[PDB]
DNA sequence: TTTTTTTTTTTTTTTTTTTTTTTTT
């Protein structure tokens, strides 16, 4: 069936707690098994990583993850990398807050 | 005679007015479309090549046509292909199947959908 | 009093207190069920801007009241959703006066901001960017006859007139008037005393490297009593009639884009090209098919020449322009390819520069692919198409024997830069919000 | 309730309109 996976930034998390998001950032800091991400949104989420991820050395990442009940924190489905070792986060933020206004296009 | 951008979302709300006869999307003619998605799952016959695949609005399969190993489970990927429905199923047949420039497409692919479906809506 | 912002159709007792920045001429239209008048008007405040629109019997009541720049009470209109796609403004909502809308002039101006030029120098404009809009001062040096053409696209007999505006940078400029501003130029007084003429809101174009046009919303004003054109007054009359100026440049279209963006529907339904006059354009398409065949020819391997190349009785291959043999023909693309977009589809052709990164891959190195396996080189191909790009291109007429038809050339072929472009469009759907 | 943003300017290069994924799930 898939269900539409929204895409998100980092006030959206309130909207979809238990549901699995898609996200956008730029790494900050990587403390064993946690990721600290920066959003589009400029607030930052905490993502719970996959033993086997190597996300270290990589800039801009998107996680597709789950909203996990506190508000803020995320368990790592599946993860994507991109930037080199240029990402538009403004555009990202953009593109969130368009396909947020476009469900027909975007969702159920 | 067209290239629409699409959402796979797009693809499976699109209506096939019964008959065998071609899809409409907002009250236009679905021919050739195109969209950004990920791969999920890659299945090989001897004959085509059929990836699961899905861009967070649903999901769909592609098959491309054998007479790519580049591509890999859980990268993103250009699709110019056309609408068929057999059986009640909905697919897409690809020509051209290609791993996306940056991720800055992915985004501006969305757009893009939403954008052409703005001027033939209104 | 209500302050612009707070504005909404959630309160029907209200008032505004504001300074028009900005008007309408009155514009009629006839179609099908309707036919009369509008016109428009934006307004300021400490909070912000609105636009405010009159139809039919407002625009006797109100278009005389309203004069730009003087500060009004307005009270008793509808405030209805802002149409995006026809107004500048970033609100939400506009006004529409009606038919118990209140209009008196307040003689209290000084809780209403005035419009802040932020006025570029003439030899500055070259750092501002095409399609935008801009505040500009200077002296008209002098001013060009009325002309009257038919655009290509509206199909609507243009007045037009374009004027040389100059500062203390020493470059010229030229600024293109249109409609009834235009014509009843010269009517306006001091106009041949060489003028400092005072321009809001003007767009940037390329045209001559930098050019200026009006829009709906433009105003220029005659020798205003702002310090800035008494520096110029002060400045012209004692040295600038004097010395020598530059004109930018690299007839008219003053305020022209040298090649618009069109959908490919647009370049058809305008019907680009099917004139003598070359139009150019720009397409953002998908390639979707290269033609195979004859895809590229034998080229005199000459400097500067590319006259193709015939295989004579001693097996070799002859110029007829320099005059000469060579055991080498030099390949050289030229190029067919179907372009996609999603509001059509449409042929374009390019030479050797542009197709070699479209193949990515010179025409020889395709032919020495091609010389071992059609696999390798249909392949190339097939690899070429899925890939979008923005196209700059030409669009003229041919005479194949006596038979006309038109050919659209890849002058320029770079590939989508999809942060920037996302940006644009962004921006165009922002305007259906 | 009701409607829009205008103009303009050039290579040297083959022939003259081209076939996009073709067939199983
Ligand atoms: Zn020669």
């Given at each position: ?5 929204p895409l998100?930034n ?19 800091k990587?403390?064993?098994?946690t990721?600290?991400?920066?959003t589009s ?5 905490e ?12 800039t ?6 789950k909203?996990s009940?506190?508000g803020?924190?995320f368990?790592?489905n599946q993860?994507?990398?991109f930037?080199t070792?240029?990402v538009?986060?403004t555009?990202?933020?953009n593109?969130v807050?368009?396909?947020?206004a ?7 | ?7 796979i979302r797009?693809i499976?709300?699109?209506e ?5 006869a071609?899809?409409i999307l907002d ?23 059929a990836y699961?695949v899905?861009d967070?609005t649903?999901?769909?399969?592609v098959?491309?046509?054998?007479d ?5 489970n ?7 292909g ?15 199947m290609r791993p ?5 497409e ?17 | 009093?209500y302050?612009?912002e ?14 028009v920045?900005?008007?309408?001429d009155?514009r009629?239209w ?6 009369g008048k509008?016109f428009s ?9 609105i636009?405010?629109t009159?139809?039919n ?16 009470l307005?009270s ?5 959703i802002?149409?995006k796609?026809?107004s500048n ?14 209009i ?9 901001p ?6 570029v120098?003439?030899n ?7 399609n ?11 001013y ?7 655009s290509?696209a ?12 100059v ?8 600024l293109?008037?249109?409609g ?8 306006n007084?001091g106009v041949?005393e ?5 321009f809001?809101?003007?767009k940037?174009?390329?045209?001559g ?11 220029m004003?005659?020798?205003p ?5 008494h520096?110029?007054r ?6 600038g009639?004097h ?8 007839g ?5 884009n040298m090649?618009?963006?069109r ?14 006059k ?9 390639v ?6 004859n ?9 500067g ?11 070799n ?5 320099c005059d000469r ?7 050289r693309?030229?190029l ?6 999603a509001?059509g ?6 030479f ?7 193949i ?9 692919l091609?010389?071992?396996?059609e696999?390798?080189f249909?392949?190339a ?8 790009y ?13 038979t006309?038809?038109?050919?659209y050339?890849?002058?320029?072929a770079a590939?989508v ?8 469009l ?8």
């Amino acid at each position: 069936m898939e269900k539409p996976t929204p895409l998100i930034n980092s006030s959206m998390l309130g909207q979809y707690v238990g549901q699995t998001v898609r996200i956008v950032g730029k790494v900050h800091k990587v403390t064993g098994n946690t990721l600290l991400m920066q959003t589009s949104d400029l607030g930052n989420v905490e993502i719970a990583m996959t033993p086997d991820s190597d996300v270290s050395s990589s800039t801009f990442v998107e996680v597709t993850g789950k909203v996990s009940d506190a508000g803020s924190s995320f368990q790592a489905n599946q993860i994507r990398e991109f930037t080199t070792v240029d990402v538009d986060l403004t555009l990202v933020e953009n593109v969130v807050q368009i396909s947020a206004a476009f469900p027909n296009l975007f969702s159920d | 005679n067209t290239l629409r951008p699409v959402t796979i979302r797009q693809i499976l709300n699109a209506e096939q007015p019964h008959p065998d006869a071609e899809f409409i999307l907002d009250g236009a003619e679905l021919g050739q479309l195109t969209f950004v998605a990920v791969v999920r799952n890659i299945s090989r016959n001897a004959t085509n090549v059929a990836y699961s695949v899905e861009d967070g609005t649903g999901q769909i399969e592609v098959r491309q046509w054998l007479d790519a190993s580049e591509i890999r489970n859980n990268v993103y990927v250009r699709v110019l292909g056309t609408l068929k429905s057999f059986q009640n199923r909905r697919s897409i047949s690809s020509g051209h199947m290609r791993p996306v420039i940056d991720y800055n497409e992915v985004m501006f692919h969305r757009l893009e959908a939403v954008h052409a479906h703005l001027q033939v809506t209104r | 009093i209500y302050p612009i912002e707070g504005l909404s159709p959630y309160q029907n007792r209200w008032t505004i207190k504001a300074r028009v920045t900005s008007k309408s001429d009155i514009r009629h239209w006839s179609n099908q069920r309707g036919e009369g008048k509008l016109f428009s008007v934006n307004l300021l405040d400490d909070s912000g801007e609105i636009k405010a629109t009159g139809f039919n019997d407002a625009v006797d009541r109100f278009y005389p009241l309203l004069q730009e720049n003087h500060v009004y009470l307005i009270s008793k209109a509808r405030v209805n959703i802002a149409k995006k796609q026809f107004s500048n403004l970033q609100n939400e909502y506009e006004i529409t006066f009606e038919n118990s809308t209140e209009i008196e002039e307040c003689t209290d101006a000084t809780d209403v901001p005035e419009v802040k030029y932020e006025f570029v120098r003439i030899n500055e404009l070259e750092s501002v960017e095409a399609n935008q809009q801009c505040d500009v001062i200077g002296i008209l040096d002098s001013y060009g006859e009325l002309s009257e053409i038919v655009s290509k696209a509206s199909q609507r007999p243009v007045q037009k007139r374009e004027l040389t505006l100059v500062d203390q940078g020493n470059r010229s400029v030229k600024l293109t008037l249109w409609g009834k501003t235009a014509e009843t130029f010269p009517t306006n007084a001091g106009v041949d005393e060489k003028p400092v003429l005072a321009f809001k809101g003007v767009k940037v174009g390329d045209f001559g490297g930098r050019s200026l046009s009006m829009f709906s919303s433009s105003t220029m004003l005659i020798n205003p009593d702002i310090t800035e054109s008494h520096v110029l007054r002060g400045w012209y009359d004692n040295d600038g009639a004097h010395a020598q100026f530059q004109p930018y440049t690299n007839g008219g279209g003053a305020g022209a884009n040298m090649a618009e963006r069109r959908t490919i529907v647009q370049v058809k339904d305008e019907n680009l090209g099917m004139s003598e006059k070359p139009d150019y354009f720009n397409v953002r398409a998908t390639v979707v098919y290269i033609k195979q065949e004859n895809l590229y020819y034998t080229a005199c391997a000459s400097e500067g020449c590319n006259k193709k190349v015939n295989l004579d009785h001693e097996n070799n291959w002859r110029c007829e322009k320099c005059d000469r043999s060579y055991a080498t023909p030099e390949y050289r693309y030229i190029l067919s390819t179907n372009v996609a977009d999603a509001t059509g589809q449409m042929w374009l052709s390019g030479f050797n520069e542009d197709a070699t990164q479209l193949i990515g891959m010179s025409a020889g190195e395709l032919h020495k692919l091609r010389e071992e396996s059609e696999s390798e080189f249909s392949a190339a191909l097939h690899r070429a198409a899925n890939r979008m790009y923005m196209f700059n291109c030409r669009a003229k007429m041919d005479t194949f024997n006596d038979t006309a038809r038109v050919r659209y050339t890849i002058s320029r072929a770079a590939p989508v830069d999809f942060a920037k472009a996302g940006m644009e469009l962004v921006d165009a759907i922002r305007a259906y919000m």
